[PDB]
Amino acid sequence: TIKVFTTVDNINLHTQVVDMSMTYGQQFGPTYLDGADVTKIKPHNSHEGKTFYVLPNDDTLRVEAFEYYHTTDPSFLGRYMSALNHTKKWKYPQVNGLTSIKWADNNCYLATALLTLQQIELKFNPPALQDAYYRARAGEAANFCALILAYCNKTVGELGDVRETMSYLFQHANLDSCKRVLNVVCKTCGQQQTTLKGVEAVMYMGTLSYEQFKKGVQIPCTCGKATKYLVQQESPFVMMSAPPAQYELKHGTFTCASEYTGNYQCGHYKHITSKETLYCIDGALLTKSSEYKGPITDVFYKENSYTTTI
Numbered sequence: 001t002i003k004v005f006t007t008v009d010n011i012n013l014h015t016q017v018v019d020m021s022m023t024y025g026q027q028f029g030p031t032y033l034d035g036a037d038v039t040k041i042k043p044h045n046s047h048e049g050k051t052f053y054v055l056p057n058d059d060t061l062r063v064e065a066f067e068y069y070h071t072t073d074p075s076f077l078g079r080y081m082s083a084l085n086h087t088k089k090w091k092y093p094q095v096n097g098l099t100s101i102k103w104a105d106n107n108c109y110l111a112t113a114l115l116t117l118q119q120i121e122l123k124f125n126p127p128a129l130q131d132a133y134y135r136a137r138a139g140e141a142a143n144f145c146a147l148i149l150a151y152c153n154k155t156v157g158e159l160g161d162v163r164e165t166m167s168y169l170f171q172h173a174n175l176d177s178c179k180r181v182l183n184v185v186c187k188t189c190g191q192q193q194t195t196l197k198g199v200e201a202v203m204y205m206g207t208l209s210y211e212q213f214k215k216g217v218q219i220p221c222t223c224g225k226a227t228k229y230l231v232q233q234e235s236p237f238v239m240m241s242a243p244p245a246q247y248e249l250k251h252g253t254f255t256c257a258s259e260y261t262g263n264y265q266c267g268h269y270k271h272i273t274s275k276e277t278l279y280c281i282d283g284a285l286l287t288k289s290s291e292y293k294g295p296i297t298d299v300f301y302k303e304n305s306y307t308t309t310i
């Protein structure tokens with residue numbers, strides 16, 4: 001009989017003694033070591049003293065699981081460990097002071113989101129996401145990528161959209177202070193002002209240029225008449241998205257952008273970031289240029305407080 005530690009958060013640990021003749025599942029339920037399902041595995045003597053992730057079976061473990069992950073979904077732990085088994089084996093090179101991911105298992109959209117998160121100000125609500133966020137910015141991003149897949153209900157290898165992934169992530173972040181007051185002017189219906197908050201205040205689908213959003217875009221009116229322009233914006237950033245089109249990216253006018261080339265869904269993502277010059281991060285590959293023209297679908301801008309003059 002070996003002694004062992006079980007946990008759900010790797011924070012609050014539990015002393016447990018396990019019989020060497022019964023499998024972990026027969027004593028704890030679904031049990032994992034570093035993402036590897038050991039439910040049907042008998043204890044090895046090398047497993048003495050190690051910490052095992054277990055599915056919550058009592059109320060103390062259920063509460064701890066929520067406090068760290070902010071979910072009661074019983075499938076979360078298993079989807080997390082299943083992804084972790086792959087992401088632990090990816091390569092996370094430092095590219096231009098940023099942690100990227102070497103290409104594997106169609107992870108190009110994950111790497112793009114990982115690079116973007118290192119360049120915008122964001123606080124995650126679940127401690128599990130926040131703690132892994134910090135570890136990722138220091139170069140150890142395996143646990144962070146697995147959580148993104150789990151929180152986004154995505155599996156390793158599945159085809160992912162960066163804008164959808166960012167949106168999912170924003171919903172698990174503290175964006176309560178974010179505000180976007182908008183205005184629509186129709187010839188017949190009149191004028192109308194809408195105030196969006198949270199995730200809807202920081203994302204727009206339609207145009208890539210923040211300037212174009214400030215000037216105003218064409219939207220159909222409720223009576224079929226209109227123009228919609230940004231009045232006030234109170235957020236640490238904004239994300240502008242449009243379907244992949246050729247776009248000129250000028251140094252200093254944006255933070256970072258998503259380049260998408262190829263067919264819908266089965267394509268490939270590249271990350272454009274604006275430093276002292278334009279940089280292109282394609283997994284572990286890095287290229288720099290003074291100007292950039294190419295197929296962009298997301299652009300990220302910096303912000304704090306903006307009030308229009310119209």
Ligand SMILES: Cc1ccc(N2CCN(C)[C@H](C)C2)cc1C(=O)N[C@H](C)c1cc(-c2cnn(C)c2)nc2ccccc12
Pocket residue numbers: 159160161162164205243244260262263264265266267297
């Ligand atoms: C790589 C990938 C994986 C998954 C998905 N999702 C989309 C729908 N989602 C509910 C599923 C989970 C699958 C999309 C894609 C994907 O390729 N995304 C690119 C950026 C894309 C978007 C749009 C477009 C037009 N409107 N909106 C709202 C988005 N159009 C494109 C046209 C041509 C080429 C690329 C386009």
Ligand SMILES: [Cl-]
Pocket residue numbers: 070071
């Ligand atoms: Cl919550």
Ligand SMILES: [Cl-]
Pocket residue numbers: 103104105106107108268
């Ligand atoms: Cl890829």
Ligand SMILES: [Cl-]
Pocket residue numbers: 151152
């Ligand atoms: Cl969710």
Ligand SMILES: [Cl-]
Pocket residue numbers: 171
């Ligand atoms: Cl949610």
Ligand SMILES: [Cl-]
Pocket residue numbers: 070125126171172173
């Ligand atoms: Cl949350």
Ligand SMILES: [Cl-]
Pocket residue numbers: 251276277278290
């Ligand atoms: Cl330049």
Ligand SMILES: [Zn+2]
Pocket residue numbers: 012013014060061064
């Ligand atoms: Zn405990």
Ligand SMILES: [Zn+2]
Pocket residue numbers: 070125126
């Ligand atoms: Zn929460």
Ligand SMILES: [Zn+2]
Pocket residue numbers: 086105156
């Ligand atoms: Zn794999």
Ligand SMILES: [Zn+2]
Pocket residue numbers: 071151172
């Ligand atoms: Zn969730």
Ligand SMILES: [Zn+2]
Pocket residue numbers: 186187188189190221222223224225226
């Ligand atoms: Zn109208």
Ligand SMILES: [Zn+2]
Pocket residue numbers: 251252
């Ligand atoms: Zn310049």
Ligand SMILES: [Zn+2]
Pocket residue numbers: 106107108109267268269
């Ligand atoms: Zn790819």
